[PDB]
Amino acid sequence: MPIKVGINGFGRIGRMVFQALCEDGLLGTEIDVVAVVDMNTDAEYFAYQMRYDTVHGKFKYEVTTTKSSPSVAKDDTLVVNGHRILCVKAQRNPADLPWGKLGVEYVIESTGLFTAKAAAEGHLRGGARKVVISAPASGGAKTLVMGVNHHEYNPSEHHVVSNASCTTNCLAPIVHVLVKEGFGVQTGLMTTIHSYTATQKTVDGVSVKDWRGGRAAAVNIIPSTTGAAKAVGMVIPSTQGKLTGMSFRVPTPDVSVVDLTFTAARDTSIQEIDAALKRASKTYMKGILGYTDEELVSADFINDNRSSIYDSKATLQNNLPKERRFFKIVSWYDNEWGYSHRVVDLVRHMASKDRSARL
Amino acid sequence: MPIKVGINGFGRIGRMVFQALCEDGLLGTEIDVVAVVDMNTDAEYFAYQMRYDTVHGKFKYEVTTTKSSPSVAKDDTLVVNGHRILCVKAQRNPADLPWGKLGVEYVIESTGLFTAKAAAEGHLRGGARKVVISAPASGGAKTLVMGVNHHEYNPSEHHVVSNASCTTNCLAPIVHVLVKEGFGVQTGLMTTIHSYTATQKTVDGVSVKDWRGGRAAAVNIIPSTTGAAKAVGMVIPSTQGKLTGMSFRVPTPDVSVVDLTFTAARDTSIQEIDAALKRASKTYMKGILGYTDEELVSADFINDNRSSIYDSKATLQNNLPKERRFFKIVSWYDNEWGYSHRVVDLVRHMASKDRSARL
Amino acid sequence: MPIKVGINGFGRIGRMVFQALCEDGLLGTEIDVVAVVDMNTDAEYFAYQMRYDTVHGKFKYEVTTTKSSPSVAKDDTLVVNGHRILCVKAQRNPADLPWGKLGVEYVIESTGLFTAKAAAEGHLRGGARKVVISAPASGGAKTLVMGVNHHEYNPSEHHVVSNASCTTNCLAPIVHVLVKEGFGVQTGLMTTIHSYTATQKTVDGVSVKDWRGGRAAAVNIIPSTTGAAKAVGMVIPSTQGKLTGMSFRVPTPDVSVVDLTFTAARDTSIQEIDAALKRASKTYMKGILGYTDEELVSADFINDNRSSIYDSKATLQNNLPKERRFFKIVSWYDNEWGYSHRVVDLVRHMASKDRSARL
Amino acid sequence: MPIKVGINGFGRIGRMVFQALCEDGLLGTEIDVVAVVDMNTDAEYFAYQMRYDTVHGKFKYEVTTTKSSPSVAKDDTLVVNGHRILCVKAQRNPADLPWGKLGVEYVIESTGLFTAKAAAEGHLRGGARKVVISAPASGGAKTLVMGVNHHEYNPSEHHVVSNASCTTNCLAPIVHVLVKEGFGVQTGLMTTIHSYTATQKTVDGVSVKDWRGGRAAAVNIIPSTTGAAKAVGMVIPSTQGKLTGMSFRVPTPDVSVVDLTFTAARDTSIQEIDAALKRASKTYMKGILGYTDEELVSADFINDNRSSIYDSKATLQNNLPKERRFFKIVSWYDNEWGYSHRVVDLVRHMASKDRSARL
Numbered sequence A, B, C, D: 001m002p003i004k005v006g007i008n009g010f011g012r013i014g015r016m017v018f019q020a021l022c023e024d025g026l027l028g029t030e031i032d033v034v035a036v037v038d039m040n041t042d043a044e045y046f047a048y049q050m051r052y053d054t055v056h057g058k059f060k061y062e063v064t065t066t067k068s069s070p071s072v073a074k075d076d077t078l079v080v081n082g083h084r085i086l087c088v089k090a091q092r093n094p095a096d097l098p099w100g101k102l103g104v105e106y107v108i109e110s111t112g113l114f115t116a117k118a119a120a121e122g123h124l125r126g127g128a129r130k131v132v133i134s135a136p137a138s139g140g141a142k143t144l145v146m147g148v149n150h151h152e153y154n155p156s157e158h159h160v161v162s163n164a165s166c167t168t169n170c171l172a173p174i175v176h177v178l179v180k181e182g183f184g185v186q187t188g189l190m191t192t193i194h195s196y197t198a199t200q201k202t203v204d205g206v207s208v209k210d211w212r213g214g215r216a217a218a219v220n221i222i223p224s225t226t227g228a229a230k231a232v233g234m235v236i237p238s239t240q241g242k243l244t245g246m247s248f249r250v251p252t253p254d255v256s257v258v259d260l261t262f263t264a265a266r267d268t269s270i271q272e273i274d275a276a277l278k279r280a281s282k283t284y285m286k287g288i289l290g291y292t293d294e295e296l297v298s299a300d301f302i303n304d305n306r307s308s309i310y311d312s313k314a315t316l317q318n319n320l321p322k323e324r325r326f327f328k329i330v331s332w333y334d335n336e337w338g339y340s341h342r343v344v345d346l347v348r349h350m351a352s353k354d355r356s357a358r359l
């Protein structure tokens, strides 16, 4: 019985994390998804939601439904590639979930409701050993970004952790290479051109806390403040205070792009920065940061499981002739997919390090 | 002048019924809107929502927000073109609204939660006299359709009424003319190509009772069943049981089209049908059934306030040469705008009638 | 002996034919694609275009480029899993094409500029033996639809043929089943809700031969006349003069749907038609007509290779209870994709019939 | 004293220039648009194009057509507010156009074919005295931006001029205030989030000069290099070589946004830049630069006739706290509409100076 995982919340977020783990060949062999929790109990509806994705395509594993015991009123178990996964109804308090009863040690917290560390602590109270929140968190709760600071994970200090946000997983790797290769970042402003999300609205509606955010998403360019760039200060502490940014939400189904403008801490050139991103992508950042030097458009990154894919041609063509300090770096991300794979990545690293803490 | 109306539901259909009421020029004069009820009190947000509409342009009446009470909090009063409108909060049960206090007889029920007649009766119990449900109603409730059967309204029998759906308001006028002109309708199947609405999702979401309906709205053609053709059978009783249809939700912001195929009861031609539609549009259906003989696309009907706009070119060019019974009729509708007007249109109707049943 | 194919026009439909072939593992076994002819000569552009597709995803095979001879400046040769394909420069006169010089016997003509039989006959003067026109043709070219009338191909008479259109290929199989099984078709009118195409415009532009068709495509529902349903009259002679239709162009990037309404020649029921279509898809229309009984939306048909995919839940839910004559049949098609696989299928049919016709 | 205008090209940009002129109430009054020149001469089609606009709504003037003479089969004259506009046939050479004959003094060159100053100088041989190119020009044509350097117009030396691009007209007013008010620009990088335009494709098409630019426009984010920021150097020579930028083409049909990142020449703050922007907009930039402090989205700028509308909240909320040198400025533009009114503003300014010159 390998790593024992539970997913709390089985909306699009939980769903895409599950399929990211099936995609990396982890189901039933490296990770056991014991259960999934949601307010919906219709397993046939979940199976359907898992089989067809308007942007990602067709799930490649068969998904059937069954009954945990012949008593049960209706199917409550999803069967994915042979593996039985139980559906459990959602609780107001995570401390009520039957984590312990189930044998689950790691909880992927994807509901979006238990983003504060002490709210998220409830899962450990219910029997779980570790919680990975699949969004930014508050109340402290180590924020960890794979390929950037994930070695700061300390098995019994960090029980409840944040995998950050999809925008921060795109930008952090770029900033990380800029700092690690010696260019440094004195000041930087980030603009993310963002595909719509599920908190947006088909037609102008009501969004009291974000007035622009409530307007019709598929026919507008909608500005929004965002915390992703300031959040990079948690994972790359030298940048606190030096970086902030904004989003413009645009009418594409998925795939987003970061437009980073920044002043380097030493004289350099867009060419040396471009060679360092490529070198990093092939070595220490492999699987987290890639680059393209082709003429790609957003559709071409769909299903890319890298966190950040540097656009070499867009970057080399639109920077200032012989500039030594003031540069623009363009990098893409499949806002839904790379992040999901990183959630799984973070869960495995933690497990690996946890098991190591017992050796 | 008088006529006291209160809109329950200040969401998108309520503000559009409200703006439909202002554009023409009835706020305060022949109609005085006194209060609006909604789950939010922010009056400042409400004014922002009224002022900017992605599809319909900018409201052309100035709107402000003053206080009404020292001691409660911010504002709660809309001031549109010199008229004060008060925002009250919503309550689980409709018989808590101060309709008598405020002195509102006619209530435009638009929240979507009180479609069952009995719930609509609640406003009666709150001091209001008559009620117009701005959606297809149930529990029994006279379904009136301006231009078709509205003049069936009985001030003594009908207190709670439903103005049907925007789709039924586009279909029933065409069908009315086919029946009234003696073309007859033996059998018919309608297809409505409908812009996406607010019950839809930007990305693949959760939609339990309509699996297709839960899929990503602005990148898909989404088929749906609809009761709008069956509803024509309640309003034009000779078609009862002979009509049905479906919907295809497509990625456009507003404006929909009815694609009606039908078998006439006797021998005709599309040219006689076409003449008869044009002739009624200029007469007995004038203001309700309009037509176009131009090369229009759905953006050309934005803000058209007819209920149904017959496309003569599309109908004449796409029918079988020499056919006598089997016909296709195409008609457009700004699903938002036209209907909004029809609600205010109905409201006046009854005011003109039910006065003269009290007087 | 691999049949030697040449593709005139290496625009979208030519590419998609090529992709369809590689996928079926035919390239270099049953078919040798010797050359693609187009106005552009840039093999590296062709390779870019083949690699990335915004709707169909990344091409899963490796594409590289080479030089036919060292002389040649830029690459003029596409290489796919070792299969070498010469990029030849288009000619205003197809008779100057070097088909004979290349040993090409079958030309797939997909530029849309040689759809007249007499113009496409220029390929034969160039050295080809047979031409398949990948659109509706004129001047008396035999029109063949796979699974419907393709056995009417006659090797000694039919040298330039038409594979009809994508819509004709979705519609025709439905009508064939109806007519073949004895339900029959007395009258019928089709509506296609179609994804926009390359002929359309991004913003309101110029289109003097289709006024509506020049308006902005991704924000409008755009009506258009269409010869698809009438063309069914050429492939299924008994339907001549009984069927016509129209199109509505909607803002989805790919995947379309036929909304057929018809009067059957005998008394039936929707249940009986539904059962026939499913049986036929499983047997004599296998590979041509598929069905679904799932809750699918347009994106779920992307890359479906069938010509027509009958929607059983949409058909069964939106028809008249107990009706015996007047019906609605819903069927999908990936307008691009199913049709390109049929082009390939027609070519193989033709090559087998030609081989049998000589010895 | 009305000036005599001719419009070369009556495609969308020429049409929007003529609509802007009309909207400013100039038609017949200050300006005699004598004729429009295009490959189409069907006056009925131009009437239809002008009457309906998917993005800008219905023309506010009535458009009818007539014939220059009785024989004129197809009408060839457009009539707005009883002003007659002759539709003349486009020529391969501007020098062969009949401007002297017609008495045209100013030609608005909008085809995009004659952006080379010496190609646009053909109009002069045709009988015109001045040419305004409604695009960036090459070959030494003087580039004039209203509100920034338009008083550099020199009647005796500038005969063929450029009104720059819609992007340059949005940026230059912003850089112009920074420089004029003493903040200065040491270096700047601009990103424009632009609406798709008529050069893009509905589906992946052919675009040998811009590989990315040939990809499906309404479902992609499409990077593109751009000359707009560097061109700011021709209008404010002090920024020569200090500015450059890029575009991301997104699937909105109109309205774009400039996201400028720059480093100021001396310490300042985002509050002082904001106050200067706002103050210039009420004074010397009035009508050219506007601002909003409301929660606006792109559709709220449709039909805004400014060149640049500074977004105060999006600017003030998304900069680095206490920053003295490194800032972001956000400004919107209706890319069609603002620029079209600037084309007319530039002709009326040239006419006043040429008028004053002769004295």
Ligand SMILES: C=CC(C)(C)c1cc2cc3c(cc2oc1=O)O[C@H](C(C)(C)O)C3
Pocket: B013, B135, B164, B165, B166, B167, B197, B199, B210, B213, B335, B336, B339
């Ligand atoms: C657009 C105008 C009005 C009358 C407001 C309107 C409302 C409306 C609401 C729903 C719908 C179709 C509709 O069509 C319309 O025309 O399908 C939905 C479900 C509930 C999925 O069946 C809910």
